[PDB]
Amino acid sequence: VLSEGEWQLVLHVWAKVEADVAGHGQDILIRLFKSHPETLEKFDRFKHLKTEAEMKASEDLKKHGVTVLTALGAILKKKGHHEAELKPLAQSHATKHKIPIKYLEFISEAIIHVLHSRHPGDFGADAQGAMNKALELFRKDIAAKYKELGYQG
Ligand code: HEM
């Protein structure tokens, strides 16, 4: 359970993201795909992309980055009271997209890295720890739904 002070740190940096949702989504997906290429293989939509320059030039990838970060921002702004938002995401990512929990750990690392690059003054260690906690809570609650459905592994 995050404290109120931890949530304020999370949402203070997140408010900085929402000024350029699409640029953050590109950086985060690109980092994810470069750092963990098995993740790219889960997107039929993106698996033709073989270079970082091709990734950066894809408008469809940029669109999907906005989809991802819009869903995550709606979850973070619930401060843990996010059952209604996680249900459908857990269900589609477990049963349709077939995304292991571990890949959610990978994208959490990419989110943290990109927020540190773009917002260092609002993402010192206290905020990095709080955001780590927020993303861990996201994964914990998604993993419980995966387990229900038979996909925790
Ligand atoms: C912060 C974590 C994530 C969030 C908030 C998120 C959010 C979303 C949303 C909102 C959609 C569209 C609606 C739906 O299908 O449920 C989507 C689609 C999808 N997601 Fe994620 N996602 C996350 C992580 C991942 C990861 C790590 C992967 C793969 C490694 C992944 C793979 C996919 C795929 C394959 C689709 C369908 C894309 C398409 O072909 O249109 N997601 N995600």
Q: Say yes or no: CB of residue 87 within 6 Å of ligand 1.
A: no
Q: Say yes or no: CB of residue 103 within 6 Å of ligand 1.
A: yes
Going by the DSSP 8-state scheme, the letter that residue 92 receives in this structure is I
**Residue length of the chain:** 153
CA angle 114, 146, 74 (to 5 degrees): 45
Dist CA 11 CA 1 (whole Å): 15
Count of CB atoms within 10 A of residue 137's CB? Answer: 17
- The tally of CA atoms less than 13 A away on the side-chain side of residue 116 is 15
128, 49 contact by CB (below 8 A): no
Q: Say yes or no: CB of residue 71 within 6 Å of ligand 1.
A: yes
Question: Hey, is 73 helix, strand or coil?
Answer: helix
Q: How many domains does the chain have?
A: 1
Going by the DSSP 8-state scheme, the letter that residue 48 receives in this structure is T
Q: Whose CA is nearest to atom 19 of ligand 1?
A: 97
C-alpha 8 – ligand 1 centre gap (Å): 26
- Helices H, strands E: what count in the chain? 7, 0
Q: Say yes or no: CB of residue 135 within 6 Å of ligand 1.
A: no
Q: Whose CA is nearest to atom 38 of ligand 1?
A: 43
Look up residue 37 and give its amino acid. P
Name the experiment that determined this structure. Answer: X-ray
Measured from the CA of 44, which atom of ligand 1 is nearest? 40
Q: Report resolution in angstroms.
A: 1.2
Q: Say yes or no: CB of residue 3 within 6 Å of ligand 1.
A: no
The enclosing domain of 122 has a CATH number of: 1.10.490.10
Count of CB atoms within 10 A of residue 34's CB? Answer: 14
Name, in order, each residue with C-beta under 8 angstroms of 116's C-beta and a sequence gap of 6 or more.
123, 128
Is residue 88 exposed (0-12), middle (13-18) or buried (19+ Cβ within 10 Å)? exposed
Q: Which domain holds residue 121?
A: 1-153
